[PDB]
Amino acid sequence: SIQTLNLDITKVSYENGAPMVTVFATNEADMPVIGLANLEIKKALQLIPEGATGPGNSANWQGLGSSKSYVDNKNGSYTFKFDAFDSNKVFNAQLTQRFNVVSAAGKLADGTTVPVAEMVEDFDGQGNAPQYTKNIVSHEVCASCHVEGEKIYHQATEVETCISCHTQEFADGRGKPHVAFSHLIHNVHNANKAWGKDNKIPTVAQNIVQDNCQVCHVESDMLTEAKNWSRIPTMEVCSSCHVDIDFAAGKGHSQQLDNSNCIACHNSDWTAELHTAKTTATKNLINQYGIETTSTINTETKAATISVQVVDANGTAVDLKTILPKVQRLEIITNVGPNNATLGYSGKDSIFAIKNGALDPKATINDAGKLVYTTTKDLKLGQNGADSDTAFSFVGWSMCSSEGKFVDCADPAFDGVDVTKYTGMKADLAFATLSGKAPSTRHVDSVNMTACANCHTAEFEIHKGKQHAGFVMTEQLSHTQDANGKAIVGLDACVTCHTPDGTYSFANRGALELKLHKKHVEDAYGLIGGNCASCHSDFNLESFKKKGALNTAAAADKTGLYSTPITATCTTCHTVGSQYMVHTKETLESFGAVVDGTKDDATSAAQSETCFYCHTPTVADHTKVK
Ligand code: HEC
Ligand code: HEC
Ligand code: HEC
Ligand code: HEC
Ligand code: HEC
Ligand code: HEC
Ligand code: HEC
Ligand code: HEC
Ligand code: HEC
Ligand code: HEC
Ligand SMILES: [Ca+2]
Ligand SMILES: [Ca+2]
Ligand SMILES: [Ca+2]
Ligand SMILES: [Ca+2]
Ligand SMILES: [Ca+2]
């Protein structure tokens, strides 16, 4: 019923001794919410300033108590009192005061569902606006990866709440420096030491965050202490990833008995630059060059000719001969039928037109300076309906590089394993038709690269390594816009290899409709759970009408097994015969499905599934049935 619960602390009065704190609660339509039964001041705190506990030391939140004692004022406002405020007798009205207010998800008496809500607000010692703050990060950055509104590890859903409990005082009281939040947060994302009573090595977190400070530390003229990540070096925080130094013993570093001198040597400019230098340099290299690609079909040979034009940052022609010795790889993959690929993985046309500065004999650089290549595999154009009139070609490429500069590829046999020696560049996509009519294109309206980049960054070099140059996905291969006129960067090019017939093995669930789900349900569940909205804005259920069979298994003789397309898509996570699927194979067949059968049988029955008579999935709730 209630979609968003907003909370504001509207009044703080110390006239009776302890503070009386009034909270106003509204819904998404700014209407007052009456009847909250689980509202609480989870923490009352005050701010010991930067350096007060010692030179170079951080500011600290000192505890003043908590309260679940409030009156519902029957107008959207609620007033708290404290039964035992400041039991430690440390209250100081010269300090900034903070209140952390939480409302548990649940149902108002009338049965109205109410979602969780959390907030903090800061004041001076009389309830006016605060004079100074410790605002370094905000909850929004975590939501780029962790599902907004769900608990992050435990206890709460917003970082300010974690920060309000995991304080220096908290850590000191337990004799455990590592549980102070500014140590913990880096610890749990970095694999140099394990964490928890379970000794978990953060392998997955490390591979996503990659120690990149800017995924959480965003400079902003909203958070006045945002630059603290580089301006306040301390042994307590810096040791979270730098785990082998003993400052006390003077091992692996000069002896430092306190934090008095860290900033004198570790100046802010240096700390900020050093931790961000590699990603900054890589992003600079990626944006040095681009490509613009065309494809045409020879109406008589029915082969496709792909032409690639390198351009500079201003989009000005660069003759490929001039940078050829620095091109590490350029690869071109062509399939047919962008809505239901027809050639399979084994039947696709593919070539490394360039490897380590050298042109393949099948590719040439023409007099206008473009690379030109003509397909050699049977593209079977027009052999499978109107969609098969269209060939689509994916171009990926890389340039050799060292320490932020492009360099010559001096080793023709360089295998691409050492990713520090080259940079994947912006990939491209080109369409051509046998008929000469406009090309068909795949829907790109349900998932796009912007969603992938929330976790992997915009500079994600997909598949970079021994097997591929690294595909960087950008507006270069956009062919449509959203309702707002923003270019959509689709993943439709990936279908060149991620075909309905699978990838190199029929046991991989390689089709694109299955592969992203399989990889992420297996390895990203700790982050995403069942949150389809992590990737999807919508489900394009109409797209199923353009699909045929999808490969779902390998037979014992290693031949391919296939399912009708809706069943195939759902069963990636809901394996037939497992505890994750109630419908038996017999029942699914009674709904028109083919389950791990022949390609012919699955193709014939592809538009015979009755699943959507009952199932009405939306991204908000994919489990919905009539
Ligand atoms: C906000 C969403 C968070 C997050 C991300 C974490 N916490 Fe807590 N936490 C609390 C207590 C009493 C402990 C045990 C400490 C001990 O071992 O003595 C923890 C522990 C953790 C861990 C494990 C850290 C480790 O190195 O072992 C982690 C990763 C963690 N928390 C994350 C208590 C609280 C709260 C008290 C009201 C609040 C709020 C939070 N935690 C919030 C969060
Ligand atoms: C105050 C207690 C600190 C803290 C928290 C750190 N330092 Fe230093 N440090 C200095 C030099 C010349 C180096 C080597 C530079 C380099 O490797 O490029 C370091 C190294 C570090 C590290 C990184 C350790 C690593 O090998 O990765 C860290 C995390 C670190 N320091 C923290 C020089 C100085 C000083 C000059 C006399 C002073 C004082 C400090 N550092 C103080 C601190
Ligand atoms: C948008 C549809 C995409 C695409 C194309 C990819 N991702 Fe993710 N990803 C996430 C996590 C936690 C992992 C596992 C990391 C690990 O186990 O070390 C992955 C893995 C991948 C890969 C494998 C290569 C790699 O970098 O590990 C690939 C190719 C890939 N993904 C593509 C996390 C997320 C998200 C967090 C909510 C989001 C969103 C995405 N990924 C989105 C996409
Ligand atoms: C992507 C660049 C992330 C951002 C931004 C934040 N987190 Fe994260 N976190 C991320 C991953 C891939 C993982 C590992 C998940 C897994 O299955 O291993 C984590 C892990 C944590 C943890 C430990 C719990 C765990 O699941 O291992 C915590 C406590 C945590 N993250 C907290 C957290 C906070 C508070 C963030 C905002 C400051 C935050 N993370 C951002 C990826 C990313
Ligand atoms: C999210 C997964 C983070 C990443 C990646 C990095 N930092 Fe961080 N840092 C994060 C949080 C939630 C906090 C606590 C903020 C608070 O209000 O308490 C911090 C804190 C720091 C600090 C302490 C600043 C202070 O005033 O004491 C430092 C020095 C710091 N972080 C440094 C730092 C560096 C150098 C990083 C890249 C290697 C980095 N952080 C990444 C969250 C996250
Ligand atoms: C994990 C999120 C880290 C935190 C917290 C801190 N550092 Fe760091 N540090 C980290 C990485 C991944 C690297 C390698 C950077 C590179 O690309 O070379 C470093 C490196 C340093 C260095 C240079 C050491 C070297 O190998 O040449 C220094 C001097 C350094 N870090 C200092 C430093 C300080 C002062 C920190 C607290 C403010 C700090 N680091 C935190 C990862 C992480
Ligand atoms: C052929 C040149 C490919 C293109 C173009 C793309 N991918 Fe790929 N991918 C390919 C192979 C041979 C494999 C391994 C076999 C398998 O099916 O798993 C993959 C694998 C993936 C995975 C899984 C990764 C894992 O660690 O398990 C993902 C998530 C994936 N591929 C995604 C993906 C995307 C988004 C692409 C377009 C940018 C893409 N692939 C293109 C081969 C090829
Ligand atoms: C990113 C890791 C994703 C998550 C999380 C979820 N889905 Fe997804 N989905 C993803 C991709 C790359 C594709 C292929 C798009 C294409 O061009 O083939 C899909 C596809 C679907 C579909 C097919 C309809 C469509 O919109 O294309 C469905 C019905 C679907 N996905 C459902 C679904 C559900 C129910 C999810 C949460 C449990 C979910 N997806 C998460 C990527 C990702
Ligand atoms: C992984 C990306 C999934 C895809 C693809 C599909 N579903 Fe799903 N589903 C997924 C999860 C993680 C869960 C929660 C499991 C649990 O803990 O209970 C679900 C759940 C459902 C349900 C509710 C289960 C029940 O009580 O019956 C339904 C009805 C459901 N899913 C339907 C469904 C359909 C029709 C799908 C294809 C369009 C589909 N799911 C795909 C994960 C994933
Ligand atoms: C009505 C006669 C249905 C038809 C036709 C199909 N499904 Fe179904 N399904 C139905 C119900 C009532 C449920 C349970 C809902 C709940 O909330 O408990 C389901 C469940 C599923 C699931 C989730 C399974 C699980 O998590 O255990 C999936 C993935 C699913 N159904 C898929 C599916 C397919 C592929 C269908 C067409 C072949 C199909 N369903 C038809 C009701 C009905
Ligand atoms: Ca207020
Ligand atoms: Ca909030
Ligand atoms: Ca760690
Ligand atoms: Ca283009
Ligand atoms: Ca039909």
Numbering used by the authors: 45 to 670
The authors write:
The mtr operon includes the genes to express three proteins: a decaheme cytochrome MtrA that inserts into the periplasmic side of a 28-strand transmembrane β-barrel MtrB9, and an outer membrane decaheme cytochrome MtrC that inserts into the extracellular side of MtrB. The outer membrane cytochromes MtrC, OmcA and MtrF are exported to the extracellular cell surface by the type II secretion system and S. oneidensis ΔomcA-ΔmtrC double mutants are severely compromised for respiratory mineral Fe(III) reduction and electron transfer to anodes in microbial fuel cells. Here we demonstrate a reversible transition of MtrC between cytochrome and flavocytochrome states that is controlled by the redox state of a conserved disulphide.
To confirm the conformation of the CX8C motif we solved the x-ray crystal structure of S. oneidensis MR-1 MtrC. MtrC has substantial structural homology to MtrF, UndA and OmcA with two multi-heme domains flanked by two β-barrel domains and the same staggered deca-heme cross present in all structures. Alignment of the MtrC heme iron atoms with the iron atoms of UndA, MtrF and OmcA reveals that the heme arrangement of MtrC has a closer homology to MtrF with an r.m.s.d of 1.7 Å, than to UndA or OmcA with an r.m.s.d. of 2.1 Å. This disulfide is formed between a loop of 8 amino acids that contains a solvent exposed phenylalanine and valine. The closest heme group to the MtrC disulfide is heme 7, suggesting that FMN would associate somewhere on domain III, in close proximity to heme 7. In the fumarate reductase of S. oneidensis MR-1 the edge-to-edge distance between the flavin cofactor and the nearest heme group is 7.5 Å, and this distance would place the MtrC flavin binding site approximately halfway between heme 7 and the disulfide bond.
